[PDB]
């Protein structure tokens, strides 16, 4: 019952784009949440971090809106954090789920040392920054788990990271900033250039020009 209004959404719906990494390669913005769940169906675990009651003073007292922080992601290298402020808690939860769905980023996993099997830790130490909260993710050997505060712990866990040291500075009591800083740190795992990425890139066709003939027929 989904009617996409986007070239990307139409191509995703009619089985033209096979993986989310095809979109991630060309950095196309995901402007409708029904795109990703078609790919990561039945594997997108979800969690509500906090419900904070922001208030705005008015003439007749102060009125309360509820803000929902929602973290989603399969435990294989995709994670997303959404924040939605709505009058009702359930509506805020749905909106935050949709925004977390839109803001799904891939996660690069590396090795602490002696690269043996599936990568388990962050490729290097990365730093996310939001407000005054600074979060640093440090690679850790196999089996250490995620040593961190609980709020970044759950986000790192559902990002697919198995082992990681974490260091935080700032007002980590601010849960929104503390989650958003870790989300930034996780998201810039591919923003970091490493010598194994030094190979000169070969360019493939963007999905738009690769299926521009099918879009004319279907998505008029």
């Amino acid at each position: 019952e989904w009617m996409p209004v986007t070239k990307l959404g139409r191509l995703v719906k009619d089985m033209k784009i096979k993986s989310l990494e095809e979109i991630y390669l060309f950095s196309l913005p995901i402007k409708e949440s029904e795109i990703i769940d078609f790919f990561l169906g039945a594997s997108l675990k979800d969690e509500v971090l906090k419900i904070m009651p922001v208030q705005k003073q008015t003439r007749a007292g102060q009125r309360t809106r509820f803000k929902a922080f929602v973290a989603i992601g399969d435990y294989n290298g995709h994670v997303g954090l959404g924040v939605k402020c709505s009058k009702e808690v359930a509506t805020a939860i749905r909106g935050a789920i949709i925004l977390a769905k839109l803001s799904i980023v891939p996660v690069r996993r590396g090795y602490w040392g002696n690269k043996i099997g599936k990568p388990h830790t962050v490729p290097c130490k990365v730093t996310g920054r939001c407000g005054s909260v600074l979060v640093r993710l440090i690679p850790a050997p196999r089996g250490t788990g995620i040593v961190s505060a609980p709020v970044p712990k759950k986000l790192l866990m559902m990002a697919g990271i198995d082992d990681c040291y974490t260091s935080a500075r700032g007002c980590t009591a601010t849960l929104g900033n503390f989650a958003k800083a870790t989300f930034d740190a996780i998201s810039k795992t591919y923003s970091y250039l490493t010598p194994d990425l030094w190979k000169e890139t070969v360019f493939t066709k963007s999905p738009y020009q690769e299926f521009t003939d099918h879009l004319v027929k279907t998505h008029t």
């Binding site: 590396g110 090795y111 602490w112 040392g113 690269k115 490729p123 290097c124 130490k125 690679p139 970091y192 250039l193 490493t194 010598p195 194994d196 030094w198």
Partner: protein, 129 residues
């Protein structure tokens, strides 16, 4: 006044790399700078560099390949032994898979991996990754 010519050169390279320039000019050249840049060039983090010879201290123009994150300096040249080289390594490097620490040894100027290969310590110079 300028007391660390290598520090000035490394900061200039770092700022030009962050700004995305293709070439950087570092004004006071020295043997230490040339050896440090030779280590970086052999590890591929920078391109060729050419030394302009005035009868004063020369200048250097370095071609930047764009694959450099940070090339800072450790200003007090601490005496680094092989026992504490590991602590220096995991304090200064982004990871164990890449990144290099250049330290001047009695055998010359070289990275920490070659220093441990030929079993010698020395004075810390800087790092690049």
């Amino acid at each position: 006044v300028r007391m660390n010519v290598l520090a000035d050169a490394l900061k200039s390279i770092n700022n030009a790399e962050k700004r995305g320039k293709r070439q950087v000019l570092i004004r006071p050249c020295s043997k230490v700078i040339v050896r440090f840049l030779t280590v970086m060039m052999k590890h591929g983090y920078i391109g060729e560099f050419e030394i302009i010879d005035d009868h004063r201290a020369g200048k250097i123009v370095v071609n930047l390949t764009g694959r450099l994150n940070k090339c800072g300096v450790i200003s007090p040249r601490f005496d680094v032994q092989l026992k504490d080289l590991e602590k220096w390594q995991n304090n200064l490097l982004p990871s164990r898979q890449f990144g290099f620490i250049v330290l001047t040894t009695s055998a010359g100027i070289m990275d920490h991996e070659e220093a441990r290969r030929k079993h010698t310590g020395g004075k810390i110079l800087g790092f690049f990754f």
